[PDB]
Design a binder for these strands. Structure first.
Length: 225
RNA sequence: AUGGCUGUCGUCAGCUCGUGUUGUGAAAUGUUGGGUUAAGUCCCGCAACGAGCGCAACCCUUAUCCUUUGUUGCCAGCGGU
């Protein structure tokens, strides 16, 4: 399973940001400029998207763990259902500095969630004071919407998928410290030197990111099968 | 030379740690920021994530009612003074 050339063109994958934000480390990923904004050379993209997709299908068959990362509301929910298809792990709201490097801390932050999840089922809040019931409930929405998508990780992922290494450069700096391959969809204004398998393109369009993770959800099903 | 015990800034609201992270390093980060509160009190944000001593609470007393008991306490409903 792979993506075609013109199907991504209808989504606007070539459309980048203004030339007032571009990063000079991507000159080999630039086609030209139209209306003072950059245009991404997609003929370079498709092959560079497939050497990554061929590598991603390798670790999916070995039953490794991947991680989708997206912290922008214009794509924050498309990454959720994408992770629901290939039942892998994801973080769609806020990347806490320490999901990988400080995993020894967030692991006990996990047990804070589980017992609170199960006692929210046996009827413990009908036994508690309404103020403590207000306390244990308000924190439940905060934790489930922060690390709820990585609640069944069981350790460290064998891979990690990123969206825009410019806004999420906190994640790419951590992933390199543990020795984990990084697959990012670096926009034209980001520095892709911290990514192993770089993929030029746009993401500020909801229809654009649906092409990506959907295809990533496909390759994982090829692997787990 | 000390222990134990006390005053004191101050009943002011602060003081630190583990891990991660930034810096050659002293250290920084968290503990800053937007509001708010008696209060690093609480929420959101955030390379920080949690934790501890404190803060508050749990304690005593006082302000209201109910239940239980009625002496040497007390005096309404009834008699003798």
């Amino acid at each position: 399973a792979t993506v075609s050339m013109r199907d991504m063109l209808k989504a606007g994958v070539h459309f980048g940001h203004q030339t007032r934000y571009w990063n000079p480390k991507m000159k080999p990923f630039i086609f030209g400029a139209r209306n003072k904004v950059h245009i991404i050379n997609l003929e370079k993209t498709v092959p560079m998207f497939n050497e990554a997709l061929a590598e991603l299908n390798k670790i999916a068959s070995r039953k490794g763990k991947i991680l989708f990362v997206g912290t922008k509301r214009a794509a924050s929910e498309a990454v959720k259902d994408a992770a629901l298809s290939c039942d892998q792990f994801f973080v769609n709201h806020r990347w806490l500095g320490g999901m990988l490097t400080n995993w020894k801390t967030v692991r006990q932050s996990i047990k804070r969630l589980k017992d609170l999840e199960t006692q929210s089922q046996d009827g413990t809040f009908d036994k508690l004071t309404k103020k403590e019931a207000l306390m244990r409930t308000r924190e439940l929405e905060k934790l489930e919407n922060s690390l709820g998508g990585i609640k069944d990780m069981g350790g460290l992922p064998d891979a990690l998928f990123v969206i825009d290494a410019d806004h999420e450069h906190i994640a790419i700096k951590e992933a390199n410290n543990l020795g984990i391959p990084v697959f990012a969809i670096v926009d034209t204004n980001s520095d892709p030197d911290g990514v192993d398998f770089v993929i030029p393109g746009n993401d500020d369009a909801i229809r654009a990111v649906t092409l990506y993770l959907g295809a990533v959800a496909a390759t994982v099903r090829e692997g787990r099968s």
